[PDB]
Amino acid sequence: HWGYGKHNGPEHWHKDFPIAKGERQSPVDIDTHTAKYDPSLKPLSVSYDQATSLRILNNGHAFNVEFDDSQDKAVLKGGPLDGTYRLIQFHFHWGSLDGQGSEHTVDKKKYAAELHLVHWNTKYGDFGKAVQQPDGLAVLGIFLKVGSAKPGLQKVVDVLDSIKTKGKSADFTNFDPRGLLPESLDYWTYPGSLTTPPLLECVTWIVLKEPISVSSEQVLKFRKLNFNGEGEPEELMVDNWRPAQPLKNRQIKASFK
Ligand SMILES: NS(=O)(=O)c1ccc(CCN(Cc2cccc(NCC(=O)O)c2)S(=O)(=O)c2ccccc2)cc1
Ligand SMILES: NS(=O)(=O)c1ccc(CCN(Cc2cccc(NCC(=O)O)c2)S(=O)(=O)c2ccccc2)cc1
Ligand SMILES: [Zn+2]
Numbered sequence: 001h002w003g004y005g006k007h008n009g010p011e012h013w014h015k016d017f018p019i020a021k022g023e024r025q026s027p028v029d030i031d032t033h034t035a036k037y038d039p040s041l042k043p044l045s046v047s048y049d050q051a052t053s054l055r056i057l058n059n060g061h062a063f064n065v066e067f068d069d070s071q072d073k074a075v076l077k078g079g080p081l082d083g084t085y086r087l088i089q090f091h092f093h094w095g096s097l098d099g100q101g102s103e104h105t106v107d108k109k110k111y112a113a114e115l116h117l118v119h120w121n122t123k124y125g126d127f128g129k130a131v132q133q134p135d136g137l138a139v140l141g142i143f144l145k146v147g148s149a150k151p152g153l154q155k156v157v158d159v160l161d162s163i164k165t166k167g168k169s170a171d172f173t174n175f176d177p178r179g180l181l182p183e184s185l186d187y188w189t190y191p192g193s194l195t196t197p198p199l200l201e202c203v204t205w206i207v208l209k210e211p212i213s214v215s216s217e218q219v220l221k222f223r224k225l226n227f228n229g230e231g232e233p234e235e236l237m238v239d240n241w242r243p244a245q246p247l248k249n250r251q252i253k254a255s256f257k
Contacts, residue, residue, distance in 0.1 A: 002016065002017075002196070002197045003060075003061070003227065004061075004227075004239055004240050004241075005235075010242050010243060013197055013199065016197065017197045017198055017199045019193070019198070019199045019200070019201060020199050022193070022199070022201055023201070023248050023249065024191050024192055024193055024201045024248070024250065025192065025193045025199065025201070025245035025246070026103070026104075026192030026193040026194070026195050026203060026205060026242075026245060027102075027103035027104040027105075027192070027195055027205075027242060027243075027244055027245065028104065028105075028190065028192065028244050028245055028246075028247050028250075028252070029104075029105045029106075029107075029108055029244040029247070030104060030105065030106050030107070030188050030207065030252055031107060031252070032106060032107050033107075034252070035188055035251075035252040035253065035254045036251065036252075036253060036254060037253075037254045037255075037256065037257050038253040038254065038255070041079055041080055041189070041253060041255045042078040042079055042080075043078055043079070043185075044076070044077075044078050044079035044185045044187060044206065044255070045075075045076070045077040045078040045079075046076060046140070046178075046181065046185065047074070047075050047076075047077070048074045048087070048176070048177050048178050049178075050073040050074060051067060051073055051074035051087065051175075051176065051177055051178075052067060052068035052073055052074070052173075053065055053066070053067055053172050053173055053174065053175035053177070054066050054067060054068055054171075054172065054173065055169050055170070055171060055172050056156070056159055056163055056169065056170050056172035057163065057168075057169040058163040058164070058165060058166055058167065058168050058169070058225065058226075058237075059166065059167075060166035060167070060227055060229075061196060061227070061240055062091040062092060062093065062237070062240055063091060063092075063160070063163060063225065064089040064090070064091045065089060065090050065091070065156065065172055065175060065177075066088070066089045066172075067087050067088060067089060069086040069087065069088045069120070069127070072084060072086065072122070073086075073087075074086070074087035074177070075087065075119070076117075076119045076138050076140060076206075079187065079189065079206055079255065080189045080204055080206065080253070081138055081204060081206075082135070083121055083122065083123055084121070084122045085119035085120060085121055085122070085137070085138040086119055086120055086122055087117060087118070087119050087177070088118050088119065088120055088127055089118050090115060090116060090117045090118065090177060090180070091115075091116055091118075092113050092114065092115050092116070092144070092222065093113060093114045093116070093195070093240050093241040093242075094112065094113035094114075094144075094219060094222050094223070094238065094239075094240065094241070095110075095112060095113070095238060095239055095241065096223065096236075096238040096239050098112045098146045098216075098219070099112075100112075100239070100241070101113040101114065101144075101239070101241055102114040102143055102144075102241060103141075103195050103241045103242055103243075103244075104141055104143075104205075104207050104244070105244055106143075111143040111144055111145055111211055112144050112145055112146050112214075112219055113143075113144035113214070113219060113222070114141055114142065114143055114144065114241070115141070115142040115143075115144065115180060115212075116139050116140070116141055116195075117139065117140040117142075117177065117180075118137065118139050119137065119138045119139070119140070120136060120137055120138075121133070121135060121136050121137070121138070124136055130202065131194070131200045131202045132200070132202070133202055134191070134201065134202060135202075135204060136202040136203075137194075137202050137203045137204070138203070138204045138206060139203050139204075139205055139206070140206050140208070141205060141206065141207040141208065142180065142181070142182065142207075142208045142211070142212055143207075143208070143211035143212070144211060144212055144213075144214050144219070145211045145212075145213055145214075146213075146214060146215070146216050146219055147213040147214075147215070148213045148215065149213075149214065149215035149217070149218060150179075150180070150212055150213060150214045150215075150218065151179065152176070152178070152179020152180050153179070153180060153214055153218055154218070155175055156175070157217075157218050157221045157222075159172060160221050160222070160224070160225055161224075163225075164224070164225060164226050164230075165226045165228060165229050165230045165232075166226065166227065166228060166229045166230075167229055167230075168230070180212065181208075181212075182208060182210035182211065182212050183210060184208070184209065184210045185208065185255075186208065186209040186210065186254075186255055186256040187206045187207055187208050187209060187254075187255045187256075188205075188206075188207045188209065188252050188253065188254055188255070189204065189205060189206050189207070189252070189253050189255070190205050190250050190251065190252045190253070191203070191204060191205070191250060192204075192205045192250075195241075195242045196242070209256065222237070223236060223237070223238050224236070225237035227240075
């Protein structure tokens with residue numbers, strides 16, 4: 001099975017998932033001097049006041065915080081998007097060291113981690129149908145740097161001991177994802193893909209310019225998670241990021257001057 005080791009990492013994925021070498025793969029490097037301001041982009045609407053978190057799961061690659069997406073409770077609209085995109089889950093990608101971990105890069109800069117808030121287009125009815133469409137998903141990406149603690153992340157950090165290994169889950173109700181956002185919603189956007197197998201080319205990427213700050217203690221607790229299952233030799237869950245892919249025939253647009 002695929003992963004992030006020497007033997008099953010990103011450079012191997014194309015053998016089982018040939019779209020790995022496709023025309024709209026993610027992540028990418030964001031060249032800030034080449035991205036063009038697009039005055040036609042609408043303001044982005046993040047409407048998370050009625051968000052209903054349910055559970056947190058260690059899936060052997062990352063951890064997902066899952067939401068009730070059976071109604072329009074936590075939605076993303078506007079920006080580059082046509083229609084309404086429901087929040088289904090968030091997760092992170094992070095490094096073994098503070099100088100790596102993000103998937104997207106900014107002028108080749110790597111951040112310590114990257115948060116992905118995953119949303120699906122309601123016109124396709126369910127997530128599994130949406131990932132088969134070029135406009136099926138919208139992923140809101142937010143960079144993490146190490147500095148001051150993020151208060152809104154601590155509830156996540158403190159439950160990680162209870163889901164140390166692959167397959168473990170825990171109740172995770174009443175978590176407000178607004179506490180993970182930066183002040184500004186300025187963004188870059190481009191058409192891309194899932195960053196893990198099956199690497200489907202279904203994603204409108206919206207990457208925020210402003211990173212959030214988390215503490216060294218917070219990211220240290222991410223790095224104590226395990227890729228392995230219970231009772232197996234320990235392999236720390238670190239470096240679960242895909243490197244930048246070729247941009248090919250794509251333009252990155254900026255929401256801001
Ligand atoms: N294209 S991709 O990224 O989806 C992809 C698919 C399959 C593989 C192959 C993974 N193995 C290399 C390996 C690495 C480490 C240990 C072991 N053996 C110990 C064990 O597990 O009993 C084998 S393995 O076939 O030997 C193997 C398969 C399944 C489970 C365990 C092992 C790579 C990459
Ligand atoms: N890094 S990223 O932001 O680009 C990104 C990468 C991967 C994914 C993973 C999406 N899920 C798994 C999955 C992948 C592909 C297709 C399907 N079809 C539905 C199915 O198989 O039941 C599910 S899921 O784990 O969130 C899920 C589980 C159960 C039900 C629905 C969704 C999200 C986002
Ligand atoms: Zn992701």
